[PDB]
């Protein structure tokens, strides 16, 4: 097949270097991670206690570790033929996107993609392995931001229970105008650090992403 | 926003009569009672603005102000900022007029419960008083909604009547 | 939107609150009244002495109420989301 | 139809550049029938097309950044 | 010189449905244009602001109805908290988990976007 | 996830609330009851003379309880954190 | 006394505009009014019920009106001569602040200027008008705080008396539980709006400020 | 000694201005004043009633007045030999900063400089003047925090006395449910305006800070 | 021999100048210090009683002092052979990063390191020293975050005790319905200033860093 | 005095710029004894003085905003 | 990995520049074998490589700043 | 320390600029020994050194302000 000239190959590569770090990271890989981290920070009872830069760096590292396998697959299948000039850029794009599309489709829901297809008026697909990139992304994004909320709620529940029980016992013992939050916050923090909330939570999130 | 603010205060005052006035002590953190019964009317008011026109009536005022004020070296007249500052005024005026049924009915229940002290001085209003007021106070809200439908229209025109004269009588006040 | 459409939305919002809270509100007062009667007939009490049973009483009411209280908010919002293309027009 | 149109535009640009390159390569090896003025004009047209393409790319990416950097 | 008109006509036809008659009439009064009994080729000076304000109005109308369920949840949790003697506990740390649980449980995103698309269509 | 799981999640979470608070609330309630029956036979009191006994009874109750109050907290949250890759599906 | 170039003149003009929220509004015009409005909300017994967005907006209307003679005097004796270009740009600033300095002296306490003059080591010297600006501004703020509280506690007492008296009848009538705040709040606002203290309040500010 | 070139001179002059809001104001001049003002506003029972802008302006004026000797000394000893270019700015900076260190030494805690020196693991430095500038600043800031907390507690005590007395008498009168916060606040404000706490408080703070 | 040209070397230096102050300082030494400072600010029962700029400056000075031995090590091991072009950047960077890698390894949690290694799917290590920085960094961040809260709860304890005892003694005499928070603040501040919490806490955290 | 020093610097820069403009005006109508290199150097010095002034003003106003826009 | 790829790219850029520089030095030393048609071409290609590297650096740091400055 | 390193770097840059300026002065005075092919090179070296210095200063000040504006 025809091959694009180098002058336009560098142009398209540099242009892709604008979108790929921003959007392909924001709405593809760790949006759920940052959402649940923010929710956990809120639930800890001390908002903005961990540095935002530290949280973002840790989230990025966990994201890289999570997507290491698919990154390796696309890396070999794209670069190595491209490095040896085996394939052209046009076919290399699709060949690299195929495993990424498969991984993205592995995690999404069904009703979201059905609704999106019905909205887009696309013809029915008898085979699941035919969703275009136009229709794949929004379904994955909405599935991710749907599961993030329930994971965050599950994280929230124990701290809510602790706050409720401490407020109830304080008011039963007779302290009405005593702010429970300023008293329960050390207890919530101790529970979290003693049960190892950070390491266990990130491990559980990684396992959930794997399965 | 005076029409909004009067509506905002009316909803808050209803809440303060049952359980939302516990911030009467020293300044707390979060108000603990603000979104309970304020945002219900803090945002319902703007809908009634959209029932007639959102910006259309305000824009029509802006065009007419240019006719009254042709942009020149004429100094801005005095004795006019005080009048519009004096307008509210109606912030607490119309607030209580809407609050006439809720304020009286809740207080009558408050008076009725207190009378039981002579029969039992251990009424424990911290136990019985709050649950009894909440159910009646919430019930009054649903059944008093139609009373609010034309009442909000009163403030809209009255402020418009206030605004229409100010923008029209100011150029001839020079 | 006619002004009726504005006020009709505020009705069921309070009614669901009336429907949801009433089982919990009634339990709180019923338990209090029993202790208030116990607060008579050798009336020795500290301030109310009713706080501990009241918390437990409504606590068990959560188990008794449970799902259908949660299910109330589930369908009402779906009805609200069903008329979103229709409330405007 | 947006990505298809963009790929068609890139295809046309790359095809014009390849045509200019192959014409120059054919000329420099001594094949008769190719004119120096013709190949120079074709190369200049290809360069103009590439400049138009990069200008369009810059405008589009600037618009994208401006419209997606705002806060909702 | 005619391609611009040919490409703009369908867009104006689509936008006219989303506009509102009252806004169009007010802007016609402002800009002293011919009302007529039958609408025909509303000028650009009038059509665009009417569409802008109509979209703002419908956006606020949808936003109010979206906000209402969370307000109901806040009201009920605050009422139950106050009734038991916990008037000073901040309901925000309690309401928010319930709000998020309801939002994820009712599948809010999919039906919300579907409703918005259907409203835009008709 | 169906709303039943949330009720199940709430039920297990709320059941912890009763069990943990039970030793503290029971000792406080009986302490007032113990004084109240002992406040016959010249029932004369000042106002309450009952709050301070609630302190020491509950205070020692927490001490004797000790780790098992925290031990349950360690286990209940650990299962929920471990079940995060399962609550998704 | 020469003029300046065009470039420098606009450089200081925009910079002077930056100080407008601070150097001219919060320490010269309505620093007393905002405190009164804030304390009045506290005295009303309905904290955070009147939004602070409108209260601040309400205050600026009153202070601009009460400052009308001062600004109009500036307009006549500075703007008109400047339009004639018969007064230096720096001269107008000097000749505009001087009548304001006499205005500040009117709304300043009798025994507060001496504090900063001894603090600044300028010496007593002679001439009440011949006073540096460095002493006038902090003294004006301190004096404004003193009169703000003095006009403040005048309004607190009538509301506190109503709260006290309504609680007294509770003990006489057997209401000994007894919730004082909930019952008294409706009566506080009814008398507040029946007599319409706002018109009395706005009128009081006008005469008291001018003195 | 040689002198820096004009380019690097203006470069460092512009660069220092970025550190100016922190290095000259926050850790040198009025941290004690701002902390004391914040604690006083907290003790008054109504934060944000004295607006933050006005409070910061008053603090700036107070610190400008209280820095008069050191400001004059650094001004002469730096500008006068530097205005006509007789000494290099690189040595003028240190020669003008030395009296600032001398002033810092008096106000800082003598028992914390040794602790900071031991933390820095510096060698035994004989003499109280040869202390490096890298050690003086943090110890000075810590001393400022300590004395600010002490002054805040001392100011708190009378208000605590007033609140306790008012609460005790109101509860002994025969009513216990009356919120003392809304009742004692007008009395505290009236007492403060009677005592004229602003003027004397500022004078006492200036005296303590200057000595 | 191999090395990098001057242009690429200065490009790498300028690029690293972006990460170095933000992240190489944020997530390496003083994140737990600023976390502890924020927790103490929350515990004092007052928002932003010590200003954020002052807190950040104190934390920066403290971490500079703490890292002094490692700074000397990396200086004498990298800069001196590099400032006299006796070593190339390629291995100079590794030699400089080695002591910091050792410090991070020393201040790490074995469980976190093992979990991160298993997540990264790399378990061929024969000794703790041969771990890569890619797997070392997130574990170090997690361990520092854990110890931050571990110290923070201990910071919380005394103020909680003071609040509980003052509330109990206040409400034991019939003053149940009055907030003791306004009364506990002066006592907590007095206790902190009397025990000199700042200077003691700085030494305590320095000793914690020295393990 | 900060105000006095600021006024002195501002009048000095304004006067130098005005003198440069007067020099340019004097040269533009062919007056004798004026050198083109001299007028260009004066113009450049005035421009660089203006640049330094605006830079220091921006830095100072930013610092003032930062110090006055904090929480007490 | 990212670090490995960055090291490989930088090392190959440095090797290209070093080869161009040593070829130019050999030419200017007078040693026969360089026709001035290779040194200039290699220098231009090295400059192109450096331009590509700096553009990639700018894009990468811009993206990193954008993703790091997000208000979480 | 960092302050000492910055002071040394600034001194080095100033020394290079001063050497270039004095060499240019010697050339323009007519003093023999300068061939105009080294003064330009030295001026360019001084300019690139100053450019590197100002770039480093910009990076450091931006980092300082963004780390001070944190929470």
Helix (H) or strand (E) holding C78: helix C67-82
Interface test with I, best of L1, L63, L65, L66 (most I CBs within 10 A): L63
Q: Is I186 on the interface with B (CB under 8 A)?
A: no
Q: What's the CA gap between B143 and B151, in Å, rounded?
A: 15
Please report the DSSP string for J33-60 in residue order: T--HHHHHHHHHHHHHHHHHHHHHHHHH
Please report the DSSP string for F3-69 in residue order: HHHHHHHHHHHHHHHHHHHHHHHHHHHHHHHHHHHHT-SS---SS---HHHHHHHHHHHHHHHTHHH
Helix (H) or strand (E) holding H58: helix H52-66
Q: Is J68 on the interface with I (CB under 8 A)?
A: no
Contact yes or no for B107/B18 (Cβ under 8 A): no
| Cβ count near D28 (within 10 Å) | 10
Contact yes or no for L65/H18 (Cβ under 8 A): yes
Q: What's the CA gap between A117 and G71, in Å, rounded?
A: 66
From J16's Cα to the closest Cα of chain G, the distance in A is: 10
- For residue D70 the two structure tokens come to 């705002």
Q: What's the CA gap between A194 and F54, in Å, rounded?
A: 30
Distances (CA, A) of I125 to A65, A69, D59, I115, I130: 18, 21, 51, 14, 7
Nearest alpha-carbon partner for F72 in F15, F10, F29: F15
Report residue B127: phi and psi, to 5°.
-105, -45
Helix (H) or strand (E) holding C14: helix C3-38
Q: The dihedral of CA B53, B59, B61, B64: what is its sign?
A: negative
Enumerate the H helices of A84-175 as residue ranges.
Answer: 89-107, 111-120, 133-173
Report residue A196: phi and psi, to 5°.
60, 55
Q: What's the CA gap between A126 and L32, in Å, rounded?
A: 90
Long-range contacts of the stretch I132-138 (C-beta < 8 A, 24+): I133/I97, I133/I101, I133/I104, I134/A61, I134/K1, I134/K3, I136/I101, I136/I104, I136/I105, I136/I108, I137/A61, I137/I27, I137/I104, I138/A58, I138/A61, I138/A62, I138/I112
Contact yes or no for H37/J72 (Cβ under 8 A): yes
| CA Rg value for chain E | 23
From F73's Cα to the closest Cα of chain I, the distance in A is: 17
- For residue H188 the two structure tokens come to 């505290």
Nearest alpha-carbon partner for H183 in H169, H198, H194, H197: H169
Contact D10 A18 (CB under 8 A): no
From A42's Cα to the closest Cα of chain L, the distance in A is: 15
What distance lies between CA A21 and its chain's CA centroid?
14
Residues contacting residue C46 through CB under 8 Å, at least 6 positions apart? F32, F47, F48, F50, F51
Please report the DSSP string for E50-106 in residue order: HHHHHHHHHHHHHHHHHHHHHHHHHHHHHHHHHHTT-TTS-SHHHHHHHHHHHHHHT
Which residues in chain C have Cβ-Cβ distances shorter than 8 Å to B129? none
From A174's Cα to the closest Cα of chain C, the distance in A is: 9
Burial (CB count within 10 angstroms: exposed 0-12, middle 13-18, buried 19+), residue I179:
buried
Contact I5 K68 (CB under 8 A): no
Contact B55 E92 (CB under 8 A): no
Interface test with K, best of I3, I5, I7 (most K CBs within 10 A): I5
Residues contacting residue K53 through CB under 8 Å, at least 6 positions apart? I8, I11, K9, K10, K13
Q: Is I26 on the interface with A (CB under 8 A)?
A: yes
- For residue L21 the two structure tokens come to 């300026």
> What does the H/E/C string look like for K1-39?
CHHHHHHHHHHHHHHHHHHHHHHHHHHHCCCCCCCCCCH
Q: Please tell me the number of Cα atoms within 13 Å of J42 on its side-chain side.
A: 19
- For residue E66 the two structure tokens come to 């979206």
- For residue E108 the two structure tokens come to 């809010």
Nearest alpha-carbon partner for C52 in I125, A171, K30, H102: A171
Contact yes or no for G152/G35 (Cβ under 8 A): yes
Enumerate the H helices of H85-179 as residue ranges.
Answer: 89-107, 110-120, 133-173
Q: Do J and E count as touching (3 or more CB pairs closer than 8 A)?
A: no
Contact A176 I176 (CB under 8 A): yes
Nearest alpha-carbon partner for B26 in A16, I45, H86, I113: I45
Q: Specify the residue for token string 């605050």.
A: E78
Report residue H29: phi and psi, to 5°.
-115, -60
Q: What's the CA gap between D12 and D17, in Å, rounded?
A: 9
Which residues does a gap of C–N over 2.5 Å follow in chain L? none
Q: What's the CA gap between I168 and A175, in Å, rounded?
A: 8
Quick one: resolution in A? 3.7
Peptide bond into B89 cis (omega under 30): yes
Q: What's the CA gap between A208 and F85, in Å, rounded?
A: 4
Q: What's the CA gap between B105 and B116, in Å, rounded?
A: 18
Q: For G8-23, b where at least 16 C-beta lie within 10 A, e where not — what string?
A: beebbeeeeeeeeebe
Contact yes or no for L46/L16 (Cβ under 8 A): yes
Q: What's the CA gap between A96 and A75, in Å, rounded?
A: 8
What distance lies between CA L21 and its chain's CA centroid?
12
DSSP H49: S
Q: What's the CA gap between B84 and B90, in Å, rounded?
A: 11
Q: Do E and A count as touching (3 or more CB pairs closer than 8 A)?
A: yes
- For residue A78 the two structure tokens come to 């794209």
Q: What's the CA gap between I128 and A128, in Å, rounded?
A: 47
Is residue H93 helix, strand or coil? Answer: helix
- For residue L58 the two structure tokens come to 């910009």
DSSP G67: T
Interface test with C, best of A119, A168, A170, A180 (most C CBs within 10 A): A168
Is residue C81 helix, strand or coil? Answer: helix
Q: What's the CA gap between I193 and I187, in Å, rounded?
A: 10
Q: What is chain J's length?
A: 72
Which domain does B129 fall in, by range?
1-174
Q: Do B and D count as touching (3 or more CB pairs closer than 8 A)?
A: no
Residues contacting residue B51 through CB under 8 Å, at least 6 positions apart? C1, C2, C3, C6
Q: What's the CA gap between I55 and B18, in Å, rounded?
A: 43
Q: Is J65 on the interface with I (CB under 8 A)?
A: no
Q: For D36-72, b where at least 16 C-beta lie within 10 A, e where not — what string?
A: eeebeebeeebeebbeebeeebeeeeeeeeeeeeeee
Enumerate the H helices of chain I as residue ranges.
Answer: 6-26, 31-43, 52-66, 68-74, 80-83, 89-106, 110-120, 133-171, 181-195, 197-209
Q: What's the CA gap between G31 and G22, in Å, rounded?
A: 11
Q: The dihedral of CA J31, J36, J37, J41: what is its sign?
A: positive
DSSP H28: T
- For residue A64 the two structure tokens come to 């890289």
Is residue J7 helix, strand or coil? Answer: helix
Q: What's the CA gap between H29 and H67, in Å, rounded?
A: 8
Contact B35 E22 (CB under 8 A): no
Contact yes or no for B88/B5 (Cβ under 8 A): yes
| CA Rg value for chain C | 20
Contact yes or no for E84/C28 (Cβ under 8 A): yes
User: Which experimental approach was used here?
Assistant: cryo-EM
Contact yes or no for J60/H17 (Cβ under 8 A): yes
Long-range contacts of the stretch G187-190 (C-beta < 8 A, 24+): G187/G162, G188/G44, G188/G45, G188/G159, G188/G162, G188/G163, G189/B13, G189/B92, G189/B95, G189/B96, G189/G44, G189/G46, G190/B96
- For residue G51 the two structure tokens come to 């939004």
Report residue J31: phi and psi, to 5°.
-75, 150
Is residue H36 helix, strand or coil? Answer: helix
Contact yes or no for I57/I90 (Cβ under 8 A): no
- For residue A197 the two structure tokens come to 């909330």
Q: Do E and L count as touching (3 or more CB pairs closer than 8 A)?
A: no
Q: Is F39 on the interface with C (CB under 8 A)?
A: yes
**Farthest CA pair distance, chain I:** 86
Backbone φ/ψ region at F42: left (φ over 0), alpha (ψ -120 to 50), beta: left
Contact A51 I42 (CB under 8 A): no
Q: How big, in percent rounded to 5, are the helix, strand and coil portions of chain L?
A: 80, 0, 20
Q: Is L23 on the interface with H (CB under 8 A)?
A: no
Distances (CA, A) of A8 to D25, G65, I197, K58: 19, 67, 65, 20
Distances (CA, A) of I134 to A51, B161, I130: 20, 70, 12
Distance from the first to the final alpha carbon of chain L: 27
Residues contacting residue I84 through CB under 8 Å, at least 6 positions apart? none
> What does the H/E/C string look like for chain B?
CHHHHHHHHHHHHHHHCCCCCHHHCCCCCCCCCHHHHCHHHHCHHHHHHHHHCCCHHHHHHHHHHHHHCCCCCCCCCCCCHHHHHCCCCHHHHHHHHHCHHHHHHHHHHHHHHHHHHCCCCCCCCCCCHHHHHHHHHHHHHHHCHHHHHHHHHHHHHHHHHHHHHHHHHHHHHC
Number of domains within chain B: 1
Burial (CB count within 10 angstroms: exposed 0-12, middle 13-18, buried 19+), residue A113:
buried
Q: What's the CA gap between A186 and A197, in Å, rounded?
A: 15
Report residue G68: phi and psi, to 5°.
-60, -45
- For residue B43 the two structure tokens come to 């945002």
Q: What's the CA gap between B86 and B71, in Å, rounded?
A: 27
Q: Please tell me the number of Cα atoms within 13 Å of E70 on its side-chain side.
A: 18
Q: Specify the residue for token string 């029915």.
A: A124
Contact yes or no for I2/I119 (Cβ under 8 A): no
Q: Specify the residue for token string 């149109």.
A: D5
Q: What's the CA gap between I29 and B57, in Å, rounded?
A: 60
Q: What's the CA gap between I75 and I69, in Å, rounded?
A: 10
Contact I14 L56 (CB under 8 A): yes
Distance from the first to the final alpha carbon of chain E: 33
Report residue I88: phi and psi, to 5°.
-95, 155
Contact yes or no for H57/G46 (Cβ under 8 A): no
Which chains reach chain G with 3 or more Cβ–Cβ distances below 8 angstroms?
Answer: B, H, J
| Cβ count near I28 (within 10 Å) | 19
Q: What is chain B's length?
A: 174
Number of domains within chain F: 1
Q: What's the CA gap between B135 and C22, in Å, rounded?
A: 7
Q: Specify the residue for token string 């059944």.
A: B143
Which residues in chain A have Cβ-Cβ distances shorter than 8 Å to C47? 174
Q: Which residue of I has its CA nearest to L67?
A: I22
Query: Dihedral through CA A23, CA A25, CA A30, CA A35, nearest 10?
Result: -40
Contact B22 E87 (CB under 8 A): yes
Helix (H) or strand (E) holding H86: none
Helix (H) or strand (E) holding G57: helix G52-66
- For residue H208 the two structure tokens come to 């303590």
Nearest alpha-carbon partner for A43 in A124, A162, A176: A162
Which domain does F52 fall in, by range?
1-89
Nearest alpha-carbon partner for I197 in I12, I6, I37: I37
Cα B119–Cα B123–Cα B128 angle in degrees, nearest 5: 135
Nearest alpha-carbon partner for E35 in E49, E45, E21: E21
Nearest alpha-carbon partner for G2 in J49, J2, J1, J22: J22
Q: What's the CA gap between D43 and D23, in Å, rounded?
A: 9
Closest CB to F17: pick one of A151, A161, A207: A161
């Amino acid at each position: 097949g025809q091959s694009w000239s180098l002058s336009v190959q560098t142009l398209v590569f540099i242009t892709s270097l604008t979108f790929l770090p921003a959007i392909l990271l924001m709405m593809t890989s760790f949006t759920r991670i940052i959402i649940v981290f923010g929710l956990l920070r809120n639930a800890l009872g001390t908002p903005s206690a961990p540095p935002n830069q530290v949280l973002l760096g840790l989230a990025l590292f966990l994201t890289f570790f999570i997507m290491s396998p698919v990154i390796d697959k696309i890396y070999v299948d794209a670069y190595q033929p491209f490095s040896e000039q085996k394939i052209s850029m046009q076919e290399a794009l699709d060949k690299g996107a195929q495993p990424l599309r498969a991984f993205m489709l592995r995690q999404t829901r069904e009703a979201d993609l059905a609704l999106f297809a019905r909205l887009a008026n696309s013809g029915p697909l008898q085979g699941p392995e035919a969703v275009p990139m136009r229709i794949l992304l929004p379904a994955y994004v909405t599935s991710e931001l749907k599961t993030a909320f329930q994971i965050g709620f599950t994280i929230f529940i124990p701290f809510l229970i602790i706050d409720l029980v401490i407020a109830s016992v304080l008011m039963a013992l007779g302290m009405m105008m005593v702010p429970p939050a300023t008293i329960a916050l050390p207890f919530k923090l101790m529970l979290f650090v003693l049960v190892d909330g950070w390491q266990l939570l990130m491990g559980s999130l990684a396992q959930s992403f794997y399965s | 926003q005076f029409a909004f603010a009067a509506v905002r205060t009316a909803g808050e005052f209803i809440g303060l009569q049952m359980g939302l006035s516990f911030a009467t002590f020293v300044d707390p953190g979060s108000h603990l009672n603000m979104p309970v019964l304020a945002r219900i009317m803090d945002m319902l008011a703007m809908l009634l603005f959209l029932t007639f026109n959102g910006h259309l009536w305000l824009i029509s005022l802006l065009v007419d102000t240019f006719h009254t004020l042709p942009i020149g070296s004429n100094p801005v007249n005095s004795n006019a900022f005080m009048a519009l500052a004096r307008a509210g005024g109606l912030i607490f005026l119309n607030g209580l007029m809407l609050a006439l049924p809720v304020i009286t009915l809740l207080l009558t229940l408050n008076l009725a419960l207190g009378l039981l002290n002579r029969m039992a001085p251990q009424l424990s209003i911290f136990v019985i008083g709050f649950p009894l007021t909440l159910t009646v106070g919430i019930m009054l809200m649903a059944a008093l909604m139609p009373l609010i439908a034309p009442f909000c229209e009163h403030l809209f025109s009255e402020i418009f009547n206030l605004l229409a004269d100010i923008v029209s009588e100011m150029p001839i006040n020079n | 939107m006619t002004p009726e459409s504005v006020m009709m939305m505020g009705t069921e919002a309070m009614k669901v609150a009336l429907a949801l809270a009433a089982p919990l509100l009634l339990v709180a007062l019923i338990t209090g009244l029993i202790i208030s009667i116990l607060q008579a007939a050798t009336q020795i009490n500290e301030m109310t002495l009713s706080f501990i049973p009241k918390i437990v009483a409504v606590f068990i009411a959560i188990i008794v109420a449970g799902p259908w209280m949660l299910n109330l908010l589930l369908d009402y919002v779906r009805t609200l989301f069903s008329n979103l293309p229709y409330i405007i027009g | 139809s947006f990505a298809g149109q963009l790929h068609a535009a890139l295809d046309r640009i790359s095809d014009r550049q390849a045509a200019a390159r192959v014409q120059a390569e054919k000329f420099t090896l001594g094949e008769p029938g190719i004119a120096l003025n013709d190949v120079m004009a074709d190369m200049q047209k290809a360069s103009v097309s590439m400049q138009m393409g990069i200008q369009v790319r810059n405008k589009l990416v600037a618009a994208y950044q401006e419209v997606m950097s705002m806060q909702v």
